Amino acid sequence: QVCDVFDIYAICACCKVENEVFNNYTFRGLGNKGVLPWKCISLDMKYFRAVTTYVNESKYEKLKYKRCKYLNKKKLQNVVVMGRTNWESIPKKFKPLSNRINVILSRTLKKEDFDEDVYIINKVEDLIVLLGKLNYYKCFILGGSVVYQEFLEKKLIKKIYFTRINSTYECDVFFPEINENEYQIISVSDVYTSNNTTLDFIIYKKTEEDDFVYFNFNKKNSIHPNDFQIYNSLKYKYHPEYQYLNIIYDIMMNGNKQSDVGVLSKFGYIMKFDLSQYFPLLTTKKLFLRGIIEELLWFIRGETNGNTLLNKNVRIWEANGTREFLDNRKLFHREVNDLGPIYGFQWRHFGAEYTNMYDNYENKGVDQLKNIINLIKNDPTSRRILLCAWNVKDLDQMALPPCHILCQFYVFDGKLSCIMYQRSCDLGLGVPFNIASYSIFTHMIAQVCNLQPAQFIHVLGNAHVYNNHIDSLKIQLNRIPYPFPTLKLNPDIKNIEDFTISDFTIQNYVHHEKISMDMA
Amino acid sequence: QVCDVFDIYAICACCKVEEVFNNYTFRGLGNKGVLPWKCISLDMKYFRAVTTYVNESKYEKLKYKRCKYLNKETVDNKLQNVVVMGRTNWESIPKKFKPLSNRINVILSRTLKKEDFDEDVYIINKVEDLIVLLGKLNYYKCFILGGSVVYQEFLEKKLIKKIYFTRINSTYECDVFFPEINENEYQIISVSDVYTSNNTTLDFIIYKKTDDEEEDDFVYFNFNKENKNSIHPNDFQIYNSLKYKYHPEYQYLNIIYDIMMNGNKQSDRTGVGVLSKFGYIMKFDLSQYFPLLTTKKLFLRGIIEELLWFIRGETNGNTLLNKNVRIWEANGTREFLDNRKLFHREVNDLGPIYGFQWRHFGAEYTNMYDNYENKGVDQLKNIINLIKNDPTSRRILLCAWNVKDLDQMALPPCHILCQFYVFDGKLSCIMYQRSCDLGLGVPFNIASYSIFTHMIAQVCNLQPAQFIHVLGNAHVYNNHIDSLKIQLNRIPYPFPTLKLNPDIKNIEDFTISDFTIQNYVHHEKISMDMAA
Ligand SMILES: NC(=O)C1=CN([C@@H]2O[C@H](COP(=O)(O)OP(=O)(O)OC[C@H]3O[C@@H](n4cnc5c(N)ncnc54)[C@H](OP(=O)(O)O)[C@@H]3O)[C@@H](O)[C@H]2O)C=CC1
Numbered sequence A: 001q002v003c004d005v006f007d008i009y010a011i012c013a014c015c016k017v018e019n020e021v022f023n024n025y026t027f028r029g030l031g032n033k034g035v036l037p038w039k040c041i042s043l044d045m046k047y048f049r050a051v052t053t054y055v056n057e058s059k060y061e062k063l064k065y066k067r068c069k070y071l072n073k074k075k076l077q078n079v080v081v082m083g084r085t086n087w088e089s090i091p092k093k094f095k096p097l098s099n100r101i102n103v104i105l106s107r108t109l110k111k112e113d114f115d116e117d118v119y120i121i122n123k124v125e126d127l128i129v130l131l132g133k134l135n136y137y138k139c140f141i142l143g144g145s146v147v148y149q150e151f152l153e154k155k156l157i158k159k160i161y162f163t164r165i166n167s168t169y170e171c172d173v174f175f176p177e178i179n180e181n182e183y184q185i186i187s188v189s190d191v192y193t194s195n196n197t198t199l200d201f202i203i204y205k206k207t208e209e210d211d212f213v214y215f216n217f218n219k220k221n222s223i224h225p226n227d228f229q230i231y232n233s234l235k236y237k238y239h240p241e242y243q244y245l246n247i248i249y250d251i252m253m254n255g256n257k258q259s260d261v262g263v264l265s266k267f268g269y270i271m272k273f274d275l276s277q278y279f280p281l282l283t284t285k286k287l288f289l290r291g292i293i294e295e296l297l298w299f300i301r302g303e304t305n306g307n308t309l310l311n312k313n314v315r316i317w318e319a320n321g322t323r324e325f326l327d328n329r330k331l332f333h334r335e336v337n338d339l340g341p342i343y344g345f346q347w348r349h350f351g352a353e354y355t356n357m358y359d360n361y362e363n364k365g366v367d368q369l370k371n372i373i374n375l376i377k378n379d380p381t382s383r384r385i386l387l388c389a390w391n392v393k394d395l396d397q398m399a400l401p402p403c404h405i406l407c408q409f410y411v412f413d414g415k416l417s418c419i420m421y422q423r424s425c426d427l428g429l430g431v432p433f434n435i436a437s438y439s440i441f442t443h444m445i446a447q448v449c450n451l452q453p454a455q456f457i458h459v460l461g462n463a464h465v466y467n468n469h470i471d472s473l474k475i476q477l478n479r480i481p482y483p484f485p486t487l488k489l490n491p492d493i494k495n496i497e498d499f500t501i502s503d504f505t506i507q508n509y510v511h512h513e514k515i516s517m518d519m520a
Numbered sequence B: 001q002v003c004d005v006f007d008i009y010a011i012c013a014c015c016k017v018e019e020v021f022n023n024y025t026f027r028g029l030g031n032k033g034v035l036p037w038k039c040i041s042l043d044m045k046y047f048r049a050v051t052t053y054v055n056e057s058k059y060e061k062l063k064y065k066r067c068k069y070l071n072k073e074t075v076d077n078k079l080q081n082v083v084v085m086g087r088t089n090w091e092s093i094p095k096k097f098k099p100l101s102n103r104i105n106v107i108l109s110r111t112l113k114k115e116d117f118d119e120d121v122y123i124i125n126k127v128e129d130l131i132v133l134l135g136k137l138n139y140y141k142c143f144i145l146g147g148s149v150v151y152q153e154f155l156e157k158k159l160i161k162k163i164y165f166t167r168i169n170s171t172y173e174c175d176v177f178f179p180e181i182n183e184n185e186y187q188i189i190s191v192s193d194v195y196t197s198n199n200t201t202l203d204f205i206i207y208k209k210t211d212d213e214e215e216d217d218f219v220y221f222n223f224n225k226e227n228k229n230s231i232h233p234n235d236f237q238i239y240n241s242l243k244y245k246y247h248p249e250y251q252y253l254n255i256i257y258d259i260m261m262n263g264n265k266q267s268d269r270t271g272v273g274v275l276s277k278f279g280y281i282m283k284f285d286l287s288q289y290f291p292l293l294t295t296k297k298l299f300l301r302g303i304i305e306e307l308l309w310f311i312r313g314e315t316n317g318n319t320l321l322n323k324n325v326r327i328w329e330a331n332g333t334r335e336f337l338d339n340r341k342l343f344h345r346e347v348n349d350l351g352p353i354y355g356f357q358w359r360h361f362g363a364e365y366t367n368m369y370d371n372y373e374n375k376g377v378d379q380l381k382n383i384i385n386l387i388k389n390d391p392t393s394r395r396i397l398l399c400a401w402n403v404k405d406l407d408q409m410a411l412p413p414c415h416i417l418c419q420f421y422v423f424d425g426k427l428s429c430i431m432y433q434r435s436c437d438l439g440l441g442v443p444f445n446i447a448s449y450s451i452f453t454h455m456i457a458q459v460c461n462l463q464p465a466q467f468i469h470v471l472g473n474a475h476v477y478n479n480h481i482d483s484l485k486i487q488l489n490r491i492p493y494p495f496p497t498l499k500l501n502p503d504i505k506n507i508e509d510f511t512i513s514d515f516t517i518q519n520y521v522h523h524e525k526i527s528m529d530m531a532a
């Protein structure tokens, strides 16, 4: 195959184009009015230069050998191929592309029409003849859409280096629909922010050593890894959603079978999400945030009245407030939906005597939420900046003891990080919401303290997958994450108590379709 | 030059012999013509896998090298390894195991000959006869299986390229010994995980004579990578020299390295200066070892008395000071309490700290002398009852962070909570630590909660599994950096074991004499401030 002999690759960047359904074809915008749809995305410029300039002299020998064999026979550079329209779009000061052998496809222009150190070729076949005559490492097709269409059509592309630009622009030219039977995603990068958009980089592919063994001399759950074909097919799984999906995989393959309803469990994990780069709302199924933002606002108001959330059509706590649920807790003297001294009460009134959900607890008990905001502002190197919901004295009065034990804060160089320790983690249903809740809370605390958010760090104690979620989670693990969305806060909010639901916007959420974790 | 062309390695297992420690601590080979120990099945398994493994696809380069060396184009002019045994060694092996399967057996003997023996098992009577025999064989590697006498001469004659050395961390009567490996002539390049087999810990160390399509994609995904701090390269030469660092002590040492290399410069209360990072997890397998650091010397009497004091529910610092346990002495002074605004607190009245929260959470603290019997929540009793009666509970947590009482404490607890997990008769524990002094505090903290896990496991009739240490604010004091650079260049020894008196079946019944550390092999003490 000519793409394998001559190492022909495509590299492109695609944005989104003007109950949405998402698929890989979501990312297809290439151009508008003969230029790019976006103003500079500097990180993609940096990636593009690194990929198209990188050469490995030690691997050249084998490539020269392979091409000589196939053909019957100063510094090494890559070849870059551009359509004439692409070429004319590039600013003069960037042309010819530095440290690369520049090739232009044109019928209307000939070598006499160019001042620059470029090769002009007038048909695809003449590129292959040219590649036979040059010393080069790899050949990158740089676009635009006519050039990509014809090279993909002729199966002349070994891999596509595809930048997913997670923002929407006016486009008039599009990357061709990639045929799923001809090209497979094999690698996915980390998620980044550049020039007020998130993006990632994916790769489509055409469809002492003895001592390691010795140390390995001493190396289950009716899970069939051929149930995880796509998941196990990927080479590089660098997208941060894989911190979650890898824990699911680990519990399924290595988990302990336990009772209450079956689970598989393991003990002790950590996930870290870079909130400066993305908002980690899972993309491998559809999540909604209205409920968990109302929950957080209800916590911050210090409320324990389940009816407040129910009147907003938020049902997160409904089951924990029923007559039957409260009586099974021995809370015979608790009104329905009076959840007792749970999160909000502990955050604003730790150590106060709970009475009922209607009482006015003003200036009763410890306002640890106000205290941690004061420590972050006035004593940011403190190792005591903890917010703790696990009030040992009050546990049996709560509808149930908190899962989210504590949040600890860390301030360095004007940036806020947060650790949340979770004693009990429902990986299939609860953890995706819990990541989103404490990520939003970190943003709120950072803003009211005039800081930038850095990391949300999630520590999982008892980490379990319900046996009833296994089939749904096998479906999810075989989906490839999309670049994450971004969270916007109203910058006018200066105090933790002053946020309302319209002060939060999730932008550029691209996701696979919703999953029922339990299939009735 | 020879040992490199013919790939001649030594494989041995050494015990300790019947207090300063060094590599030569591990030198026991034999007693009265047999092995000093009863039988260590994991070393048997390692020995068999190492001495039998061969890689067909890597032979061409070995044969090529050997032919070139011997001025030949072919060996003669199923790939196996050669194993070389002393006659005493050979005559100590039982019949059913001789000759050693899937290996070319060679025996050094001056007094026996090929007539006395059989098959394709070679006798040789000089060491030079091995080199000519290797010149004439197709084999992968050559392993010297010893005898003291055999290792002695092969090491003198400089004929060993690597030593595969098993460290058996227990003491036996020995009459023969492995030669002192000179530090200038051999260096450790790799160290394994620590195991238990047949009532001893052991590890495996290695001494050395002193589709690449997806390979570029790795370079592309790395295009945005930067190494902050003015710690030097040469300064961690031994640490950076090792290839495989599988010993569990590296979970601690790798965090020190990470903080030194990538940590954030901050200035804490005493303007000492730290390097800090946020969020780590260490996991220690208490079924296989007791994780007492071996790269410096650590003492445990104080740390045990501290836990016994917590378990009694005590808050009286004088109790510990009267036993010369001075861990809380700084936090109980008039000056320290006054600076905490505890003007009405007696000296060494630490307030409602760990022991009070563990036995009496929510009770009104009065003074360190009051009778709190039956006041507040006995969380320690409650978690023991949950482990025994509801072991799949996800609510088995023991929490010292009482938000209501923090300001009454001499200081708020560093060790926020313990969570327990029970599976298949085994107990694991997570401890979450808000503030971690990596150089001085964390080594003790790992020991304290590993001991506590053993005590809870034992009173609940469970076996300990993991101790899992979660670090929040993890910092290295700038005044510890020189000492931690010395420590990171020390290779760990196999870990000791903890033995509890097995008769103790109630958490309140332990006494200092119920705790024994066995087989603690450690580098020299380090004063973390002004290098020792
Ligand atoms: N986002 C991204 O990754 C990229 C975006 N772009 C954008 O794409 C748009 C330009 O793309 P589009 O208009 O398709 O134009 P192209 O850059 O694909 O250029 C088309 C021209 O190349 C020549 N050509 C193509 N194939 C051949 C052939 N086989 N033999 C001879 N000549 C050939 C012809 O030139 P002639 O007419 O002179 O014969 C043809 O008109 C722009 O908006 C640009 O900004 C460009 C590349 C990448």
Ligand SMILES: NC(=O)C1=CN([C@@H]2O[C@H](COP(=O)(O)OP(=O)(O)OC[C@H]3O[C@@H](n4cnc5c(N)ncnc54)[C@H](OP(=O)(O)O)[C@@H]3O)[C@@H](O)[C@H]2O)C=CC1
Pocket (backbone or CB within 6 Å): B011, B012, B013, B014, B028, B029, B030, B031, B032, B033, B034, B035, B085, B086, B087, B088, B089, B090, B092, B108, B109, B110, B111, B112, B124, B125, B126, B127, B145, B146, B147, B148, B149, B150, B151, B153, B176
């Ligand atoms: N812990 C471990 O890893 C190991 C321990 N052992 C233990 O060590 C002890 C046995 O070793 P040790 O007593 O030294 O005996 P060795 O096995 O070293 O055997 C010594 C005999 O080998 C022959 N020999 C040695 N060198 C030569 C030579 N250069 N040329 C010809 N023959 C040579 C001689 O036998 P002859 O008299 O026939 O000439 C010599 O007397 C036992 O207690 C055994 O269990 C053994 C192996 C490994």
Ligand SMILES: Nc1nc(N)c(-c2cccc(Cl)c2)c(CCCOc2ccccc2)n1
Pocket (backbone or CB within 6 Å): A011, A012, A013, A036, A044, A045, A048, A082, A086, A090, A094, A097, A141, A142, A143, A161, A162, A163
């Ligand atoms: N991933 C990726 N792939 C691409 N093929 C391009 C692209 C877009 C238009 C023209 C050209 Cl030559 C390249 C970019 C856009 C970033 C690089 O844009 C250029 C940088 C330097 C010189 C020319 C274009 N990103």
Ligand SMILES: Nc1nc(N)c(-c2cccc(Cl)c2)c(CCCOc2ccccc2)n1
Pocket (backbone or CB within 6 Å): B011, B012, B013, B035, B043, B044, B047, B085, B089, B093, B094, B097, B100, B144, B145, B146, B164, B165, B166
């Ligand atoms: N790491 C290590 N190295 C070794 N050189 C030996 C050793 C000890 C005595 C005799 C022999 Cl042949 C080997 C062992 C002991 C485990 C294997 O011991 C035997 C193997 C086969 C037959 C008899 C003993 N472990």
